Amino acid sequence: DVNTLTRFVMEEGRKARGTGELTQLLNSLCTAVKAISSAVRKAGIAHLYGIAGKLDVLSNDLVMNMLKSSFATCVLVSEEDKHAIIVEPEKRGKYVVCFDPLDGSSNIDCLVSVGTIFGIYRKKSTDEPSEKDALQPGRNLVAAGYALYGSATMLVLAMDCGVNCFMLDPAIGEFILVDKDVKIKKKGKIYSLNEGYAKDFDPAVTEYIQRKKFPPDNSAPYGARYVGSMVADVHRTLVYGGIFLYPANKKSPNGKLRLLYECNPMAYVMEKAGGMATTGKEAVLDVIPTDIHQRAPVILGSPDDVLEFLKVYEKHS
Amino acid sequence: DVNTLTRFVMEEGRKARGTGELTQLLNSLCTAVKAISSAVRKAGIAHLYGIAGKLDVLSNDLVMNMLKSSFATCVLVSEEDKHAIIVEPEKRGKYVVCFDPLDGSSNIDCLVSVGTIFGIYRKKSTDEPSEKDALQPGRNLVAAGYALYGSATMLVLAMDCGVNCFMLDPAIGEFILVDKDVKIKKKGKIYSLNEGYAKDFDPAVTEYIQRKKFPPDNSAPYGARYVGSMVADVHRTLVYGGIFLYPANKKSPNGKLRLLYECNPMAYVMEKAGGMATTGKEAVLDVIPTDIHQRAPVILGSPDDVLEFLKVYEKHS
Amino acid sequence: DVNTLTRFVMEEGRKARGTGELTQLLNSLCTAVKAISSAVRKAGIAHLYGIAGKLDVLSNDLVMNMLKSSFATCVLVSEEDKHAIIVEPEKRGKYVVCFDPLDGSSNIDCLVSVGTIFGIYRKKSTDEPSEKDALQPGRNLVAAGYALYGSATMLVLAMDCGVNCFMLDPAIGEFILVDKDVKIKKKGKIYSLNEGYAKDFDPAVTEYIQRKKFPPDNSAPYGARYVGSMVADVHRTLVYGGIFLYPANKKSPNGKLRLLYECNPMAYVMEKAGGMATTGKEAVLDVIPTDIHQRAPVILGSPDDVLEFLKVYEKHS
Amino acid sequence: DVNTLTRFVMEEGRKARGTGELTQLLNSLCTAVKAISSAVRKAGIAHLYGIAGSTNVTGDQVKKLDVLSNDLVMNMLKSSFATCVLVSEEDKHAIIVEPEKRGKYVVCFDPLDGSSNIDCLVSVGTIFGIYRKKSTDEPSEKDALQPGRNLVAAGYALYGSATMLVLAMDCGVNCFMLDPAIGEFILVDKDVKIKKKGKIYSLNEGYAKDFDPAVTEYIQRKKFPPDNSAPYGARYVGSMVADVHRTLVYGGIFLYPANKKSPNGKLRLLYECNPMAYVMEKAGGMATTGKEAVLDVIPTDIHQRAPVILGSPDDVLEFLKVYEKHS
Numbered sequence A, B, C: 001d002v003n004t005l006t007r008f009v010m011e012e013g014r015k016a017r018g019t020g021e022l023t024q025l026l027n028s029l030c031t032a033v034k035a036i037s038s039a040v041r042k043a044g045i046a047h048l049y050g051i052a053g054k055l056d057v058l059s060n061d062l063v064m065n066m067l068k069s070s071f072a073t074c075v076l077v078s079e080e081d082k083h084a085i086i087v088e089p090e091k092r093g094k095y096v097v098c099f100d101p102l103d104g105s106s107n108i109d110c111l112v113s114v115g116t117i118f119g120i121y122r123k124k125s126t127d128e129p130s131e132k133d134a135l136q137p138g139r140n141l142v143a144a145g146y147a148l149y150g151s152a153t154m155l156v157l158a159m160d161c162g163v164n165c166f167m168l169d170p171a172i173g174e175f176i177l178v179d180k181d182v183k184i185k186k187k188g189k190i191y192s193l194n195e196g197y198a199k200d201f202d203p204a205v206t207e208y209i210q211r212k213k214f215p216p217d218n219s220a221p222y223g224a225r226y227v228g229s230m231v232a233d234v235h236r237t238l239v240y241g242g243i244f245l246y247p248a249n250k251k252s253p254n255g256k257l258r259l260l261y262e263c264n265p266m267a268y269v270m271e272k273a274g275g276m277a278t279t280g281k282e283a284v285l286d287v288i289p290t291d292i293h294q295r296a297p298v299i300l301g302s303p304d305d306v307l308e309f310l311k312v313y314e315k316h317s
Numbered sequence D: 001d002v003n004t005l006t007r008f009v010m011e012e013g014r015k016a017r018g019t020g021e022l023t024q025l026l027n028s029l030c031t032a033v034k035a036i037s038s039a040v041r042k043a044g045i046a047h048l049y050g051i052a053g054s055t056n057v058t059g060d061q062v063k064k065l066d067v068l069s070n071d072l073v074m075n076m077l078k079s080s081f082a083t084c085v086l087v088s089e090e091d092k093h094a095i096i097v098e099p100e101k102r103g104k105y106v107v108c109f110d111p112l113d114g115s116s117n118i119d120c121l122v123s124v125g126t127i128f129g130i131y132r133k134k135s136t137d138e139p140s141e142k143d144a145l146q147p148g149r150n151l152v153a154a155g156y157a158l159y160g161s162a163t164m165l166v167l168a169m170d171c172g173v174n175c176f177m178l179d180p181a182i183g184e185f186i187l188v189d190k191d192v193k194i195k196k197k198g199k200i201y202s203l204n205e206g207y208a209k210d211f212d213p214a215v216t217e218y219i220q221r222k223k224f225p226p227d228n229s230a231p232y233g234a235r236y237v238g239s240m241v242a243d244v245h246r247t248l249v250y251g252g253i254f255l256y257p258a259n260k261k262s263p264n265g266k267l268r269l270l271y272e273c274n275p276m277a278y279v280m281e282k283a284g285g286m287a288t289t290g291k292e293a294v295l296d297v298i299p300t301d302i303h304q305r306a307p308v309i310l311g312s313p314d315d316v317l318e319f320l321k322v323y324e325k326h327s
């Protein structure tokens, strides 16, 4: 039987017998994602070029406005906003959403794959909503995932029930379930990091990458891929296995990616798919944040690959 | 004034006072590309998943059928076909087209950017049309370019008048001219290659990459990007500058990329944009092919970057 | 605040605290309507004409399969099927749906507006479901409405809470609420019927029409409009007010339109909008059917217009 | 072989060995029609209703559709470099194309015919007629005051259940279906010809009290045939492109005649009656004012009205016989 995101989410909600807010939140996100995809694909660009005589801001406004209007949220943290957005009282719901509305958009001028990343928390206290309501470890996530605006648009949704992938059919604006309960390979054959900055690598990163290129045994070197857009590189890691790294070094001891709306949602997707996501020192999902925009190092992907990285990491510790 | 691919090509044709065949060929190609884009973005995928109860083959069929019916072609070489396709007598025109209908599609399962690459030649010999009509050096190209199905769909068309970039507006199915007479940066800050083959690199490649990561003048290291899809990596190279390399290795001693419908069209785009494209020993466009599917090593991109590589290549003889 | 069909329906469901089946049914219908719209607008028609080398059947299959897979239905009556379809046990829910999947499609060759009409009933008994479960008076309707595939695509949904109109935004495949709690004009200025059957008209219809052309109170004559596609004619009646007639004639002594999936849903939409719908002798919604394909005469629209017709009808005893 | 509007037009141009301006004009129009279709189908309407907040709505998105359609047609024709004088239903005076963008063609068009009732989602359309400028004077409004006989090409786009462009030239009438998945007009019916006689009549009968006596009698013959044949069916959408296109595909007769209150009719000669009359005649149909062929009226005002009776030749001839009987 054909299954849509709308039907899938609603059936998960019925089985859980929640209040319906999470379902409304997910419907609003899906609508925002379809609108981002339409704009990312440049629908209407002819009008901008005068046929009748910003993209990351627009994407943020789409997510912000759809989530506010869901009546399911009270605190919104975006990569685009200095401060957490507090939802107005008459529209408050119980969920906190941290999101990057258009990840990788810095390089969108080369038409590289871009994406939207989101993580959904339940507000824990009855206090007046504030930025602190988003300062939860990723292990508290109720749902997380991403939309990839690649060759096609796909939404990957991770919940307690596992990871499910939905392909956007743009002819009808429906996300069609195409991969159920996905699991990552135990061990992959691709490593993914920006090797242009090798001179700044932590010595452990240098050694691990060297083992991928010059294996000490008789196995094949790993292939290298680095899109530079986190959603694309993570999704490839999910689909094909392997390891993705944006690690710490001396110049950047906390990494560069952002914990709340990049590392944690991806870490959650990975673990729900049977993968791993570490800072090197702890699981990403166990970091307790103190700042809504704080950075975290992230090494994620197939468990055997991440464990091997941790073995080398400890060797230099 | 807004300008479309249709209007642009027709206006180039009027000025040249040709017979109109090249214009009809390009109109057909544009139509095929819009049809490829729609299928790549998964329009109609819900019917495949049962709402009412292969992508590279379809792409090949679209290009083949649109080109045959243009009455402008006589010999068609596709990555998808072992032998050259000879157009039936009643539809034959004067042009030979070499194309990759859906480049990068091996990894389309992770929704990586894919593309269509094409090169157009005038049939040179007066013999009955045959596979040999496609065995022309790239310097004989009349027109070449590619469509990138990335975050948006863009057609890059290079002719004697230069390189022009058209964004597909999917709301109206029109390619809108958005970048005229494009020129690549003289020198970039990104290098692009699969570093997993580091164990197989010739010393010149190894040294060049080492200069990008550890510059001897103590300037900033280059960033690294490698999508693994040639159209995406070359388009980023064109738009941001820098260098793209696919040299020979032990699996691919004559290189990996195909001369006829990957290297030559990209080399032609590069040169018309003020860039360079070399095998290491000669310019790609000067290689005389003997086999329609033969491979070639390629180093292309910003001229200062390729020239620096060639100095290293010469230092190692 | 922007509102979607999905969000709107789910909020009505949350307030009523039902089992969720009606919501899942309405989501499935909405999906079917978007797919019918895409096909009606001829998306993909180029593939039918050989670019790479039935509409009412497809519409019926789309509605049938989406309703079956909703797990919300047990009995399905379609204009396209001689007998009621009994949903197999593992997919059964409590609702009976009567629908015309592509109304007006006989003239779709002139690209006349077409539409989808539906009426939803709750099955009352614990008996095994059967065709007789659809033999309910319109008064028992739980929900009804139509999709109009006109210059744009619009879904009109009537429930106990009133009538709401949603515009399909094809850029994102979303139904946007554009008119809330719709009410028809008390009196219109347009009458709508096929006057080619004037030779067969009941004297009451003949006199009523003569009053529209030669008003007895010295007002302006009514304009005439008759698309010949019921959904288009009824929707204009809803939007501008006025009256729509399909009375009996010699070919159709019980009228021509079908009671279960044309007259009753339109009668229900009209009444929830403050209009009227009569056979001449009784309210459409009060007719108790004995056959799922039985026909009924129908006069509907603004209350003052319908009352005026009824006064003429009673004058003719 | 599959055929597109672009390929088809270019092939007619190659055979004629013209300058290519007419082909560029038709390409520009085709682009404008695709944009009108997208807007008419309400692409992007969610932004008007606040999906991105009360900030991200653009200038073109707020414009009413008939203004936007006029802007699309105007700008695409100007930029074709093929036109010198443009007449639109929306503009009191003719637009004279600026000198550096001038070509030899005069275009009269109705950018969004029927849009007054677009609020009920009625079929709407774009109507166009193309003339070659005849005089050596500087281009001016007078260049559009040509009889329909002088038309080089005409036709319409219908935004109905699907979008179709009907294009009439000397080679006849061809119908192209817009495939919105790829934005291509696909040729679906070649060299179209109307039925000799139909079974549908189309006019606003609500205004029967004002009918010309000949119209009253003709309509009475359609509803109460004297030879005991079947009465005609009636259809009246109220949108000319829809009613005329149905007439072309199914046959029959469409009337917007004169009366004492409107002795010259209601529809506009330059950009409604003449293009529709040209299409009808190229399809083997007829189009009359009652007194003469529509295409023979020589206009004196770009917005002058004309009565029109068109459709299957047998039907129009029967109408004219009744009209002559009433002298």
Ligand SMILES: Cc1cccc(S(=O)(=O)NC(=O)Nc2snc(C)c2Br)c1
Pocket: A009, A010, A011, A012, A013, A014, A015, A016, A017, A018, A019, A020, A021, A022, A023, A024, A026, C018, C019, C020
């Ligand atoms: C995706 C998801 C998972 C778990 C919980 C939720 S929820 O809290 O939103 N609850 C619901 O949706 N309940 C619903 S849905 N239909 C009914 C009849 C009910 Br009771 C959503």
Ligand SMILES: Cc1cccc(S(=O)(=O)NC(=O)Nc2snc(C)c2Br)c1
Pocket: B009, B010, B011, B012, B013, B014, B016, B017, B018, B019, B020, B021, B022, B023, B024, D018, D019, D020
């Ligand atoms: C893109 C391009 C460049 C050079 C040559 C060509 S061509 O060989 O196709 N010739 C033409 O198009 N001639 C045309 S087009 N309109 C007219 C009136 C003429 Br004469 C195409």
Ligand SMILES: Cc1cccc(S(=O)(=O)NC(=O)Nc2snc(C)c2Br)c1
Pocket: A018, A019, A020, C009, C010, C012, C013, C014, C016, C017, C018, C019, C020, C021, C022, C023, C024, C026
């Ligand atoms: C449109 C409509 C109106 C009335 C009744 C229905 S229903 O019978 O389908 N019930 C529900 O939807 N219950 C729902 S929805 N979310 C929750 C948490 C619950 Br409890 C649907």
Ligand SMILES: Cc1cccc(S(=O)(=O)NC(=O)Nc2snc(C)c2Br)c1
Pocket: B018, B019, B020, D009, D010, D012, D013, D014, D016, D017, D018, D019, D020, D021, D022, D023, D024, D026
């Ligand atoms: C549709 C139409 C019909 C007749 C005349 C025209 S035209 O005047 O625009 N001329 C052309 O198109 N010439 C063209 S097109 N390609 C070539 C090589 C040439 Br020569 C257009």
